[PDB]
RNA sequence: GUUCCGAAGGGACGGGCGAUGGCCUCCGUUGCCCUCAGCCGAUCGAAAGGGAGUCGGGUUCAGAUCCCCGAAUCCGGAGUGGCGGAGAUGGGCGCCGCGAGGCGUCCAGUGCGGUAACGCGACCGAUCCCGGAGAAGCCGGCGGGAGCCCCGGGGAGAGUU
RNA sequence: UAACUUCGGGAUAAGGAUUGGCUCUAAGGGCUGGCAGCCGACUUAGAACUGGUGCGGACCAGGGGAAUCCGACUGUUUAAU
């Protein structure tokens, strides 16, 4: 039962973003010419929003509920699949595989992930996806 | 041959009194007093026997002069625990929490049944 | 001691305020310009004689130049 | 049923297809070609929990062999140690139909 | 080739300390210098570090055991009896 | 007697109050209150243990890693930080502009690269917790790097003839 | 190369032969492109000749065997009988 499909929450087990949560936006089950191994384009979050409680000002809540995101290619060996699923409509034409040869495109893709991560987090679902892992 | 002497008032072959030979621009052979060989940090996991990588191996009080990038690596637990045990810790925490959720839901199901 | 491989950055170093003097060494196959700053001695090494002399004129006027042999 | 599962494994590895080892059984599970996974009783608890989680994700059966990796390997008929193995094609054996 | 008839590891003691003492120390010497198989990884990498302490070269796992053997019959019978006692206690 | 029968602390981020100086800005000195706070016991004990950081040439009658010259380096300090660089300077929409480019609204911005081990010159963060280095026996064998010795020739000067 | 033996020793047991100088021979390896070229470093074995039988020529350098008594052994002890 092939389960590594877009919308599948994963944990990054290696690299700079180790222990960070991410959601798959594209999977390549058979490696291309440049990457012989199977891999996946993923977009995750770097800095989780801080714990927000009542009795705080609206400015403080809005300032502490900010997300910084990342986008990267990973190995299935370096990814750990969970059982949760997050269905956030990332735009494919901006979040895609040719983005890594231009920093401006990379920044646009990161911003595009960030804005809708903010939107869903403020809606308040996928709280497991948005609260950090305690390891 | 030219056989030479110490340069300090310590005349015993102790740990601090270690020297090497060097030929000076005056065409002479002298002792220089070397520094004690430092060690890279050992992993905080307490299991891996090897040293950490990407961290300079110097005598501990020299680490004040180094910059931060030459002291750690860009990762969670960077420069304090090795990558293998980092990834096993991540996996262990996640799977343990999943098992805890499973046992909680089974307990709730049993409470409903009873 | 530091070795400067470029020319205009060496010129900047010469115009620095801590520069006390510049000394010119003329040895076979080579020309060396040594600026004495506060912390380091900066050496610019060049192998062309007319480049060396035009740099010598291009050196700042208010800094003590001393050729040595 | 240890004798009968030894017989089935001998037949499976005579005829069908299999992979021996954790880092390759994981690849087979992720590709979904793994029909059955078998784990020795002395494999590390962390990785056996990992394999169980992967099998639950991929809807695959897991069997806890009743011997450690040395005689799991000898039951495989290999002269080394295997902790986890994956049957990909049962072949002419009723290992899946236990 | 076979270099000795009776004495094995105790060939290093020469003609000293007596035949009976050498014989009764030979088996303990063999037992304490043997390599045992690890019950945790299956490799034969169990060495006695110090008296009562056994170490695996691959697992990096340390076990408390006998002075000259990896485990003693007293230890194994105590373990079995304690298991049976717990089984009876919880019925 | 040395933690044993002690009310064994005179410290601190921050918050509040009260005064002061300095362009009363903002901070500092403080004075009071709130809040936080285990130490294993004062103190002594190594010119061979632990312990950051200096080397080369010259110089006397007798002193040199100490004097002179030349190259360095560590620690501490610095209101105004003395300067520079990083943070950090972007995107959308709407106008004007043939365009280049510029004006208005919004919104983001506690850094990036690599599959990875890791890398880049920086790259916020307190009480608290965790770990490492300091920090180690004796013997054997092997390998690498030096210094000395050895060998084959070029010079310069001396001996024999 | 013996008695004996705690089978480890005894053991260099005991007892014999050889050893100089010179001229040769054979074997023992690298690098480059079953072959070829270019480089080597020390050793071992054998042979001919030769000296007033002399050769580990100075220095260095275990006498041995057969038994008895005592203490198993290594170790320590009355600085000045
Ligand atoms: Mg000392
Ligand atoms: Mg580093
Ligand atoms: Mg003291
Ligand atoms: Mg001292
Ligand atoms: Mg005798
Ligand atoms: Mg008698
Ligand atoms: Mg005696
Ligand atoms: Mg006496
Ligand atoms: Zn480790
Ligand atoms: Zn083991």
């Amino acid at each position: 039962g092939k389960f590594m499909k877009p919308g599948k929450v994963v944990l990054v087990l290696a690299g700079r973003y180790s222990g960070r949560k991410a959601v798959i936006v594209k999977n390549i089950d058979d490696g291309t010419s440049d990457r012989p191994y199977s891999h996946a384009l993923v977009a995750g979050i770097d800095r989780y929003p801080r714990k927000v409680t009542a009795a705080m000002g609206k400015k403080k809540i809005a300032k502490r509920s900010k997300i910084k995101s990342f986008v990267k290619v990973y190995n299935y060996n370096h990814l750990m699949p969970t059982r949760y699923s997050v269905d956030i409509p990332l735009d494919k034409t901006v979040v895609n595989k040719d983005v890594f040869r231009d920093p401006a495109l990379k920044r646009k893709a990161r911003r595009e992930a960030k804005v809708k991560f903010e939107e869903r987090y403020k809606t308040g679902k996928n709280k497991w996806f948005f609260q950090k892992l305690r390891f | 041959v030219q056989r030479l002497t110490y340069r300090r008032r310590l005349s015993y072959n102790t740990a601090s009194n270690k020297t090497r030979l060097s030929r000076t621009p005056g065409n002479r052979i002298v002792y220089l007093y070397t520094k004690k060989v430092g060690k890279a940090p050992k992993s905080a996991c307490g299991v891996c026997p090897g040293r950490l990588r990407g961290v300079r191996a110097v005598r501990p009080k020299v680490l004040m002069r180094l910059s931060k990038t030459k002291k750690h690596v860009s990762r969670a637990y960077g420069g304090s625990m090795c990558a293998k045990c980092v990834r096993d810790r991540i996996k262990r925490a996640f799977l343990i929490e999943e098992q805890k959720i499973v046992v909680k839901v089974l307990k709730a199901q049993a409470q409903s049944q009873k | 001691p530091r070795k400067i491989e470029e020319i205009k950055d060496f010129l900047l170093t010469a115009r620095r305020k801590d520069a006390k003097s510049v000394k010119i060494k003329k040895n076979k196959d080579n020309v060396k310009f040594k600026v004495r700053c506060s912390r380091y001695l900066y050496t610019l090494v060049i192998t062309d004689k007319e480049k060396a002399e035009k740099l010598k004129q291009s050196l700042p006027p208010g800094l003590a130049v001393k050729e040595l042999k | 049923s240890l004798e009968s599962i030894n017989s089935r494994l001998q037949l499976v590895m005579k005829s069908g297809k299999y992979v021996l080892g954790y880092k390759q059984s994981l690849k087979m599970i992720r590709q979904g070609k793994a029909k059955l996974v078998i784990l020795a009783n002395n494999c590390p608890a962390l990785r056996k929990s990992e394999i169980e989680y992967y099998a639950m994700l991929a809807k695959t059966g897991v069997h806890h062999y009743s011997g450690n990796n040395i005689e799991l390997g000898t039951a495989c008929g290999k002269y080394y140690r295997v902790c986890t193995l994956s049957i990909i094609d049962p072949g002419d054996s009723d290992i899946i139909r236990s | 080739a076979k270099r000795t008839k009776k004495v094995g590891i105790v060939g290093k003691y020469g003609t000293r300390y007596g035949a009976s003492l050498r014989k009764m120390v030979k088996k303990i010497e063999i037992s304490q210098h043997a390599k045992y198989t690890c019950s945790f990884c299956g490799k034969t990498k169990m060495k006695r570090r110090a008296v009562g302490i056994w170490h695996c070269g691959s697992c990096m796992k340390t076990v408390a055991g006998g002075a000259w053997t990896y485990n003693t019959t007293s230890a194994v019978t105590v373990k079995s009896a304690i298991r049976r006692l717990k089984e009876l206690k919880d019925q």
Side-chain angles (χ1 to χ4, degrees):
Chain A
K2 190 180 292 293
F3 50 74
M4 295 299 291
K5 295 183 290 295
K8 189 74 171 176
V9 176
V10 301
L11 293 170
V12 184
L13 290 179
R16 213 168 92 239
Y17 304 102
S18 296
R20 300 288 217 296
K21 284 180 191 74
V23 69
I24 297 169
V25 289
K26 187 177 185 293
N27 66 305
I28 301 92
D29 291 331
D30 62 358
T32 75
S33 73
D34 61 357
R35 288 183 175 91
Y37 40 70
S38 66
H39 59 296
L41 182 63
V42 74
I45 62 170
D46 189 358
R47 286 188 286 110
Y48 302 75
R50 292 184 181 178
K51 181 180 76 174
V52 65
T53 79
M56 293 180 183
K58 297 300 291 183
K59 292 177 69 67
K60 200 166 181 33
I61 297 169
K63 190 176 182 182
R64 295 169 101 251
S65 65
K66 293 192 289 186
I67 293 144
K68 154 173 199 152
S69 78
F70 72 94
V71 58
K72 188 179 281 188
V73 176
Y74 280 118
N75 287 325
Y76 289 168
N77 300 336
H78 300 294
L79 288 164
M80 186 66 204
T82 65
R83 93 191 191 280
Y84 308 103
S85 297
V86 181
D87 62 358
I88 303 186
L90 272 297
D91 193 2
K92 297 293 180 68
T93 187
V94 68
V95 185
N96 63 7
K97 191 176 179 180
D98 63 358
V99 72
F100 312 102
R101 280 82 65 193
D102 191 73
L105 277 296
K106 194 160 223 165
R107 287 185 286 112
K108 285 182 30 66
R110 288 204 261 92
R111 178 68 181 273
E112 182 65 26
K114 182 186 290 184
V115 294
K116 59 180 68 65
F117 291 166
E118 294 293 328
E119 182 65 26
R120 182 76 58 94
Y121 167 73
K122 293 182 186 295
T123 61
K125 298 181 291 295
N126 305 329
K127 295 185 302 328
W128 186 95
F129 179 79
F130 284 85
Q131 65 183 357
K132 65 192 291 183
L133 191 74
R134 292 317 306 253
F135 81 90
Chain B
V1 311
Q2 194 257 309
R3 61 198 190 280
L4 61 84
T5 67
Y6 281 123
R7 319 175 56 170
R8 291 160 187 192
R9 282 194 207 288
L10 179 62
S11 84
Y12 302 104
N13 198 240
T14 62
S16 56
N17 210 57
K18 294 311 189 152
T19 57
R20 68 180 177 92
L21 277 80
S22 66
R23 188 191 317 281
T24 65
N27 195 357
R28 291 184 291 112
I29 301 295
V30 301
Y31 291 167
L32 271 297
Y33 287 81
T34 62
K35 303 298 185 291
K36 297 172 73 175
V37 167
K39 293 180 181 180
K42 184 180 287 293
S43 167
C45 72
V47 177
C48 292
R51 296 289 187 267
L52 304 181
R53 281 83 61 195
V55 184
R56 289 278 308 281
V58 290
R59 185 63 50 187
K61 198 184 289 184
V62 186
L63 287 165
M64 200 189 312
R65 316 204 285 279
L66 278 300
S67 66
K68 188 182 284 291
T69 185
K70 290 187 282 186
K71 280 183 269 173
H72 73 88
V73 298
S74 293
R75 181 185 29 221
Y77 298 80
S80 162
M81 185 180 288
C82 62
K84 184 178 290 295
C85 309
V86 168
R87 80 184 40 180
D88 307 285
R89 260 176 172 64
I90 307 186
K91 283 203 286 292
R92 206 187 290 280
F94 165 75
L95 295 148
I96 283 301
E97 280 185 86
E98 294 294 328
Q99 183 62 255
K100 181 171 68 68
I101 292 156
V102 171
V103 69
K104 190 182 297 321
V105 69
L106 294 174
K107 186 186 289 184
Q109 180 176 1
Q111 182 64 255
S112 65
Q113 293 176 357
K114 68 182 291 294
Chain C
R2 255 65 162 151
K3 181 174 71 68
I4 299 169
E5 69 276 17
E6 182 65 26
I7 297 89
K8 68 181 178 67
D9 62 358
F10 168 92
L11 183 63
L12 194 61
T13 291
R15 292 184 291 113
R16 268 171 64 180
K17 64 182 181 293
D18 50 356
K20 317 159 64 142
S21 69
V22 298
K23 45 184 46 183
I24 296 164
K25 178 69 171 66
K26 177 65 175 67
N27 43 26
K28 277 74 178 175
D29 192 73
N30 188 358
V31 177
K32 291 185 180 178
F33 293 77
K34 293 181 181 180
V35 303
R36 173 80 262 191
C37 302
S38 179
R39 167 168 181 173
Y40 295 119
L41 186 80
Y42 289 105
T43 300
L44 173 62
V45 55
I46 62 170
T47 61
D48 185 75
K49 304 295 183 291
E50 59 88 19
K51 288 176 70 69
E53 61 86 20
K54 69 167 69 68
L55 183 63
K56 182 179 185 292
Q57 287 70 241
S58 179
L59 286 186
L63 187 55
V65 65
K66 184 260 288 182
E67 69 275 16
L68 61 83
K69 188 260 181 183
Chain D
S1 66
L2 183 63
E3 68 279 15
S4 182
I5 191 166
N6 289 318
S7 85
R8 307 181 180 60
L9 294 174
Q10 183 177 3
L11 186 61
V12 161
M13 293 181 286
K14 182 175 174 66
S15 66
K17 293 187 286 185
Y18 56 76
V19 292
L20 300 175
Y22 165 84
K23 190 166 73 174
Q24 191 173 4
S25 295
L26 275 185
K27 293 182 183 293
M28 295 296 172
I29 291 170
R30 291 189 296 272
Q31 282 163 0
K33 293 182 183 293
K35 299 289 94 175
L36 169 61
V37 190
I38 295 171
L39 280 75
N41 64 333
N42 75 350
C43 69
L46 178 67
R47 60 167 52 161
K48 72 167 69 176
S49 171
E50 166 149 8
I51 296 298
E52 293 179 353
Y53 197 85
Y54 273 86
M56 183 267 307
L57 289 195
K59 308 301 164 313
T60 309
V62 289
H63 179 85
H64 287 129
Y65 191 77
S66 65
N68 68 284
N69 63 7
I70 297 171
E71 67 292 12
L72 179 46
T74 65
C76 302
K78 301 292 176 68
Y79 285 93
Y80 48 88
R81 295 181 297 269
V82 296
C83 287
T84 187
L85 60 87
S86 296
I87 297 89
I88 299 168
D89 188 358
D92 55 0
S93 178
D94 48 330
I95 192 66
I96 301 299
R97 281 82 65 193
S98 58
Chain E
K2 184 71 136 43
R3 309 163 290 232
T4 61
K5 183 191 200 274
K6 295 180 177 66
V7 285
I9 188 63
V10 301
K12 67 209 181 94
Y13 294 122
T15 78
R16 281 179 304 280
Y17 322 130
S20 293
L21 271 68
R22 289 193 268 102
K23 184 176 76 174
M24 62 204 315
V25 75
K26 184 166 120 162
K27 67 180 293 294
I28 279 157
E29 196 83 347
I30 293 172
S31 176
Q32 68 174 354
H33 285 85
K35 277 78 173 176
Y36 295 86
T37 189
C38 201
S39 67
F40 297 88
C41 65
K43 317 213 189 72
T44 64
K45 295 286 290 153
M46 294 299 291
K47 297 290 294 298
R48 186 174 69 86
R49 184 179 296 113
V51 61
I53 305 148
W54 299 80
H55 190 49
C56 183
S58 174
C59 291
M60 295 296 172
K61 205 162 280 272
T62 301
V63 192
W68 324 116
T69 54
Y70 170 65
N71 50 35
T72 60
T73 176
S74 179
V76 309
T77 187
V78 166
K79 184 177 184 293
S80 65
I82 288 280
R83 178 194 46 66
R84 185 179 296 113
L85 267 186
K86 182 175 73 175
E87 287 307 83
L88 188 153
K89 181 173 75 174
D90 53 43
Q91 289 86 23

